[PDB]
Structure formats: structure tokens, C-alpha cells
Structure 1
Amino acid sequence: GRRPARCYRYQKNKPYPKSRFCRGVPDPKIRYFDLGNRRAKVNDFPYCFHLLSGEKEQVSSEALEACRIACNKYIAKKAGKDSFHLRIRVHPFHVIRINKMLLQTGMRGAWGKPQGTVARVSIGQPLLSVRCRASAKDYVKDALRRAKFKIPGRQAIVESRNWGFTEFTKEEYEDLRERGELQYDGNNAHRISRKGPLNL
């Protein structure tokens, strides 16, 4: 029911989203983008890992769903369902067309019908991210390895200096918490206000 994925690998067309001009698009395969334990506080999971793209290409939503299930299932075995939070970074927003052979007209009136969706990714862009505690730190790179075999091309697995899905480094974050100057949201941490009406 699908062409082999080599038929839509590279970014050759201008982006073509579903809109009031494009209609009849089938539903993508991936619909959950935040798995694991997303409601855990910012202070719980200080470790973060990524899977950076090594190519400028297109990833299908069928492949995004395969890589989500591979990674998630592996960690939920070695470490339990609540030691990690896994986020899929890229979203499938681009529509690919097909000019369907069967009377048969060939290249006359060859503008094709919607057939699928793909995500448009660039060099060094993250595709998956994980934040976890220390009890899972050993097995995250094993689950990222699983996902890599579902994605076309060359991918790189790296460990970040940031604190979780926050924006400070661990040493930076530690000190800011050490003196007080750092705000807390739910699972994200910000800085002192220092602007606007004093209190009331």
C-alpha cells in the first residue's frame, strides 16, 4: 500500500501543508509525542540524551511511529515506566503527492493527490530526546540505538550538558538553585523576574 521510502527521501518541493488549499489528507500514523512520565517535576530528571540528525531529508510518519514504539518499549523494561520522559521532537506537517497509474493519460494533467505526510529535518537537528533519573542512565543509549535502525540515513547519539529539558547546564543550574535566583515552573526552570511592577 506504500511506495518504498526512497521515492520521497529528499527535500525537493517547497513545503506543502494541509490547509484550505490542500484537502483530503489521510491521518498521520503518529499521534503521541510525549511518552514516559511527563508530569514529573524539573528537579527529578537531571540527565538528558539526544539523537541528532546527520542529513537534510524527510522522515515519514510511518517511520516516526516505528521509532517511538521501539525506544519506549525498551526503557519501560530495564528501568520501569516512570524513570524517564521521552519526547519526539519533529512533527509531520508536509504532504507528499502521488500521480496514480490505472483511460491512462501519463504526463497530461499529472498533478497528484495527497498520499501521506513527512517531517522535514535538517543537519544536526534533534529527532528524539530523553530526560531520566540515575536509575535509567545506563539503558537510554540502548533504546536510542533501537530507534536509529528505523530512520533513513546517518544519525548520531549524544549526551548533553544541560539539565533535563531545561536550558541551563548542570553546573549552571546547580549554582542558580544554590543561591535562590532561579524560578520554577512545573517541569521547567526560569530566572528571577527583575522587571515590572514591584509587587502589587
Structure 2
Amino acid sequence: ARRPARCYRYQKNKPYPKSRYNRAVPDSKIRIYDLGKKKATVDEFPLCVHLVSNELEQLSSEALEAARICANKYMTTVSGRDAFHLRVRVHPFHVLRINKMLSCAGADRLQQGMRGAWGKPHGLAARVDIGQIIFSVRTKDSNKDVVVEGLRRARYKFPGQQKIILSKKWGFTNLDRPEYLKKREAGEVKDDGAFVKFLSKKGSLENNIREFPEYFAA
């Protein structure tokens, strides 16, 4: 039995991470932050959809895991496992405390009241801000409705208000769609494992020649 999230919704305390001074806190309910075809190339999933926060509040690890499970389940049900890449982009680092006591008749016989009321760790939450992304799903443009609907389903597990925004960037890159297109029909971009490597006008020319040969051999 855990406390209702209305008791920890708001960012009342300073950040309280697990550290050398906490050193005994529960494990986060969410442990997997990448789902779907997370190994896909950047060219494969051009469209990106964000579920972003519109409130300054705390998102529980419990709620994060529930919403991630719900959205992943919906996308795998409707369009398939290898049709998308979902990234949970908030990690619960803030530790919530509880002043636990016996709850029974004659409870004042061991309570001690508010004396020594410092709490012990009992949960984890992610501290999110206005406009901060919570979920990021990259997929093909054919899967836009599927992905927005999966994010809309995930929205029900979260407190506060969230928005679904179609990113102007290419997938999980920080390049706009046409700017990335121009940089890719040029020779500046390179396929990494899952992200994109960039060519800059700095650094040693021998290393620049060794990498990105298509730009230079033009």
C-alpha cells in the first residue's frame, strides 16, 4: 500500500536524490526507457511525436512505468513492435519521503507526533517542468495517428496536463526535417548505431578524410 499521488504531486521540496546521504531508497518502478525498434537507423523513423508536460509537477516512477507500458502495448497491438521507437525522457531521481506511523485505535501510544518527523524514502518521482518532453516516439509518417493515439492513451496515467506535439525535427535528431534532408543529400551526416554523427569544419583533416568520405569525394 502506497500513498496517493496527490500527496506528492507538487515540487514542494528541494531535489532529494539517492546519494551518499540517502543511500537506502527503493528501486524505481520504471527500469526500461527505450522500447520498440530502438536499433533503427535515423533515416528509418523520420517522424517524431512528443508527449510534453504543461505543468511544473512531479511524475511518479509508478505512473511513468504504467504510462510507458500502456503506450508500448497500444503501439505493438495496433501497428507492431518494429514500427516505432519509444523513449521515456524523464528519469525519476527525486526521492519522496513518508512519515510512517501505526494507524489504529490508541495510536498516540507510540506515535510521538511531529517530534523527529523526518521521513524515510518510500518512492521515486521525476521532476518535470513546463514544456518538458515526457515521451518521445519516432516512427514512419504512416504511423502518426497510431503514435499520437498511443501517447493519448499513456496520458491517462499521468497527473496534470500534457500535450501531444508533432516535432519539426527528423526523428530523435536536433535537425529540422528539411535541414537534415539537405545535410543528408550532402555529405555532412553519417549513420551511427542509432543516432547521427556530424561533420564539422574543425578538427584534423586526416581524421575528417578518414571519416565522412562522401562529402570530400564530391
The 1-side partners of 2:27 and 2:7 are apart by: 20
Partner of 1:63: 63
Deviations 1:63-99 (A, max 9, x none): 0111001100111112111010000000010111111
1:120 to 118, 127, 145: 127
The 1-side partners of 2:18 and 2:188 are apart by: 44
- SS of the counterpart of 1:129? strand
Alpha-carbon distance, 1:194 to partner? 2.4
Assess if the C-alpha contact under 8 Å between 1:141 and 1:157 holds in 2: yes
Partner of 2:115: 108
Partner of 1:37: 37
Assess if the C-alpha contact under 8 Å between 1:131 and 1:164 holds in 2: yes
- Extract unaligned runs of 5+ from structure 1: none
Partner of 1:5: 5
2:194 aligned with 1:187:
yes
- Which residues in structure 2 correspond to 1:133-172 (within 5 Å)? 133-172=140-179
User: Partner amino acid for 1:114?
Assistant: P
Assess if the C-alpha contact under 8 Å between 1:83 and 1:135 holds in 2: no
Alpha-carbon distance, 1:53 to partner? 0.3
TM-score for both structures, normalised by structure 1: 0.96
Alpha-carbon distance, 1:183 to partner? 3.1
Alpha-carbon distance, 1:104 to partner? 1.6
The 2-side partners of 1:151 and 1:107 are apart by: 31
Alpha-carbon distance, 1:114 to partner? 0.9
Partner of 2:216: none
Assess if the C-alpha contact under 8 Å between 2:98 and 2:121 holds in 1: yes
User: Partner amino acid for 1:133?
Assistant: K
Q: % of aligned pairs identical?
A: 61
- SS of the counterpart of 2:184? helix
- SS of the counterpart of 1:111? coil
Aligned length: 200
Assess if the C-alpha contact under 8 Å between 2:59 and 2:128 holds in 1: yes
The 2-side partners of 1:168 and 1:193 are apart by: 14
- Extract unaligned runs of 5+ from structure 2: 103-109, 208-218
Name the structure with the higher helix share. Answer: 2
Alpha-carbon distance, 1:186 to partner? 2.2
User: Partner amino acid for 1:96?
Assistant: L
Moved over 4 A (4+): none
2:86 aligned with 1:86:
yes
- SS of the counterpart of 2:157? coil
Greater shift, 70-79 or 186-195, is seen at 186-195
Q: Tell which structure's C-alpha radius of gyration is larger.
A: 2
User: Partner amino acid for 1:48?
Assistant: C
TM-score for both structures, normalised by structure 2: 0.88
Alpha-carbon distance, 1:189 to partner? 2.2
Assess if the C-alpha contact under 8 Å between 1:79 and 1:135 holds in 2: no
Greater shift, 115-124 or 174-183, is seen at 174-183
User: Partner amino acid for 2:173?
Assistant: T
Alpha-carbon distance, 1:177 to partner? 1.3
